[PDB]
């Protein structure tokens, strides 16, 4: 029909016909549709296929636009594939002063294209097949054909001919610096090092002219780290060696918090006895934790500065990091020092608060502050309270998760629809494209997961497969599925080698793909942990653990640059508001002022939020920052996320902030968001900065056998903190020697 049932909800397989509620603005109305119906990829590459990568724009666009594999750029043009490395004369700091804006970026030059010797011009390039972090593309002109297989962390392009052979073609003659007949050496007229390998026995030629050719099927091109001729022969082990498989496995250890990631390449040798291996760039996020088995195999000599900073070689068939997952919560506990009647107070103001937007984004903004506030009604005895904001949630998903009206015909919004062509989870109505582009599924959906992680919490009659928890379940697999989903692609909002998640679907940009919220993302990682642990399933919680802790580590490094090794000295910013493959910006999507371009890498605050605390040193850094560029504590706008930030280091210049002007807010303002951002409020303001004054500062050096908890570290005294939903009661070890009792569906406290 038009509708599949899954429990009590159902999702629509035929497109909806949308109503607009009478709206002419050509931005929204466009934005109720689908994404696009070609998708450039071979007749090998079947079923849902993968989105919001670092190389989608080879499968939207009939060629390529600009990407990173790192430590390369590259694109596909009907002459061949342009090949690029930004060399710090290539690489600029831009600012637009009185916009408060900044930019890192490079060139989209072109160092050398390679050919195909018997075509000028190929009609066009297709994902000809994948995997967790390489790519084949297909230059196709009937007989002839050019496959290149690339990736992130990959200092080699492999290049297979199908009736031709290689030409390599300059602007400028390249100096050739070695040349032993099949292993070529060669600089660019601007002195960027690389290296071409074709199989023994077949010489190159047009040594000292603008084109290099070889008769040979296959080449492999190589980005050298320096001009050197042991690097040059330590390249040519592991050239012959091209990759078809890679694959990112992970375990989680219950007991030490530890997440394990494994990566591995299977390679197929062009020339005989070529080892089962490569030669790994990895980046900082990697070799910063890198397990002791892999520290043997680094070349520490073999860098390459990129965007992102330095990446170093490693050569082997794998390598594996180690990162420590260090608990969530599904809200702050009951231990701040309010007044609890005016607390009690701001709990009854929220009930004035309406979603701003008919959208999947603002009504996800809307339920996530329900969802809040429901705990914290809870916690302060004002159970009727407590019950509206859950039923209400209810009554949102109820609607939202239910595709047909009463008769069974399709509704025309708050609904969610199958897109088989991609195959992928589109709601109605959309924003932020979505569902034109696929973006943002993880920021959006994260927030219907929250909702039902709450719902779950208190009524797991509700979250039952047979009832509402299927449909849940579905918007899960839409943006993180597990291996071989029948609907959707693995993984689909997470690059597991990059460390982060991709939020465009279809990565048309020259600067490769872009992620701006990555507190949105962590937000949407957390719900699924409490979700699953609500419900039962620990595979899903484990990959959200797994996900979680990847990208806390991506974070770090990408946004924070906490250790001070990334962003270049004459950057001012202390944070990267969006990073994309080939450059980091100072900016936002949408036209805002200077808090917005820090807050927007913290919002929303909840129980996953701690990790925004691990680092104090940074956090009193940015704070800073932000203050001396403000020129006071008067916030331009979301003055509640600053001061619930400055609390993870000085909860008492936070509390004097918020005391302040916090009631120079009344009830629900929409239009005015100086001093409430408007996905929070009064309440959970007050909540947050009153527990973390109590708490002191969040202690990452002790972990926990159990994967829902807090330790916190006030001068000495911890405060630790642990939820159970489990129906048995649990004893929690902590890495410390503490220990604590938890009774079923509750909090404990412990102090030491
Ligand atoms: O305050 C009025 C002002 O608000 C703007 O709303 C912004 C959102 O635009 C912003 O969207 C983010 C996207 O850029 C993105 O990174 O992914 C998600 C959405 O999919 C968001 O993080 O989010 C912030 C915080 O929620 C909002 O304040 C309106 O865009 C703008 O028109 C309006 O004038
Ligand atoms: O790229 C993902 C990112 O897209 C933003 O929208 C932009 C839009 O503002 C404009 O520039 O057009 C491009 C496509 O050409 C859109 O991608 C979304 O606002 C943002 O939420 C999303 O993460």
């Known amino acids: 029909m038009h509708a599949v049932s899954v429990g009590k909800g159902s999702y629509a397989t035929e497109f909806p016909e949308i109503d607009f509620g009478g709206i002419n603005d050509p931005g929204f109305r466009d934005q109720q549709g689908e994404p696009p119906a ?407 959906y994260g927030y219907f997961v929250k909702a039902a992680a709450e719902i779950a919490r208190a009524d797991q009659e509700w979250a039952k497969s047979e009832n509402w928890g299927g449909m849940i379940d579905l918007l899960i697999r839409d943006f993180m599925a597990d291996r071989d989903d029948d609907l959707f692609p693995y993984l689909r909002m997470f690059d597991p080698y990059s460390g982060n998640s991709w939020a465009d679907g279809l990565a048309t940009f020259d600067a490769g793909n872009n992620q701006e919220s990555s507190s949105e993302a962590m937000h949407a990682w957390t719900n699924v942990i409490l979700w699953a642990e609500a419900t039962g399933n620990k595979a899903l919680r484990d990959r959200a653990i797994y996900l979680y802790t990847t990208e806390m580590s991506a974070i770090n490094e990408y946004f924070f640059d906490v250790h001070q090794e990334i962003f270049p000295e004459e950057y001012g910013p202390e944070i990267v508001t969006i990073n994309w493959g080939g450059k980091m910006d100072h900016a936002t999507w949408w036209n805002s002022g200077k808090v917005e371009k820090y807050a927007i890498n913290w919002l929303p605050f909840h129980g996953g939020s701690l990790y925004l605390g691990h680092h104090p040193d940074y956090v009193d850094r940015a704070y800073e920052e932000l203050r001396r560029d403000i020129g006071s504590t008067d916030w331009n706008l979301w003055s509640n996320l600053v001061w619930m930030y400055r609390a993870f280091t000085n909860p008492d210049d936070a509390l004097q902030q918020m005391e302040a002007s916090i009631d120079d807010y009344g009830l629900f303002d929409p239009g005015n968001e100086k001093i409430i951002e408007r996905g929070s409020t009064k309440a959970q303001t007050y909540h947050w900065i009153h527990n973390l004054a109590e708490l002191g500062r969040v202690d990452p050096t002790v972990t926990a056998n159990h994967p829902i908890y807090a330790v916190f570290n006030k001068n000495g005294n911890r405060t630790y903190i642990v939820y159970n939903f489990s129906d048995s009661p649990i004893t929690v070890q902590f890495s410390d020697g503490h220990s604590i009792q938890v009774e079923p569906h509750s909090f404990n406290i412990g102090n030491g």
């Open 38 to 444: 070609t998708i450039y990829r071979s007749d090998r590459v079947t079923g849902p296929m993968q989105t919001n990568s670092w190389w989608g724009s080879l499968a939207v666009d009939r060629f390529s636009m600009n990407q990173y594999p790192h430590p390369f750029s590259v694109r596909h043009r009907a002459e061949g594939l342009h090949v690029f490395y930004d060399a710090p004369h290539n690489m600029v700091v831009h600012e637009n002063r009185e916009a408060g804006t900044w930019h890192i970026h490079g060139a989209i030059g072109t160092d050398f294209t390679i050919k195909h010797s018997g075509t000028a011009n190929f009609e066009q390039a297709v994902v000809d097949d994948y995997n967790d972090w390489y790519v084949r593309g297909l230059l196709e002109n009937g007989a002839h054909q050019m496959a290149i297989t690339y990736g992130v962390g990959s200092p080699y392009i492999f290049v297979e001919y199908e009736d031709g052979s290689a030409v390599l073609d300059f602007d400028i003659a390249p100096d050739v610096w070695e040349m032993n007949g099949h292993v070529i050496g060669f600089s660019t007229h601007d002195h960027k090092h690389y290296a071409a390998f074709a199989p023994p026995g077949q010489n190159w030629s047009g040594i000292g002219s603008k084109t290099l050719t070889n008769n040979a099927d296959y080449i492999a091109i190589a980005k050298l780290p320096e001009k050197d001729g042991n690097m040059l022969a330590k390249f040519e082990q592991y050239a012959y060696s091209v990759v078809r498989d890679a694959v990112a496995d992970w375990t989680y250890d219950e007991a030490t918090g530890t997440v394990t990631t494994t990566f591995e390449v299977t390679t197929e040798a062009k020339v005989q006895g070529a080892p089962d291996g490569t030669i790994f760039a990895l980046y900082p996020h990697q070799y910063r934790h890198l397990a002791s088995s892999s520290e043997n195999q680094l070349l520490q000599n073999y860098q390459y500065e990129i965007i992102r900073g330095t990446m170093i070689g490693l050569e082997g068939k794998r390598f594996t990091t180690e990162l420590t997952y260090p608990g969530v919560l599904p809200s702050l506990p009951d231990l701040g020092d309010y007044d609890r009647e005016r607390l009690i107070g701001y709990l009854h103001d929220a009930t004035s608060d309406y979603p701003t937007g008919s959208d999947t984004y603002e009504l996800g903004k809307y339920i996530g502050k329900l969802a809040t506030l429901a705990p914290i009604a809870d916690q302060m005895g004002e159970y009727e309270l407590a019950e509206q904001f859950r039923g209400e949630l209810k009554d949102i998903l109820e609607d939202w998760l239910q595709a047909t009206n009463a008769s069974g015909q399709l509704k025309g919004k708050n609904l969610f629809y199958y897109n088989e062509n991609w195959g992928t989870i589109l709601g109605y109505h959309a924003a932020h494209s979505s569902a034109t582009r696929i973006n943002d599924h993880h920021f959006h």
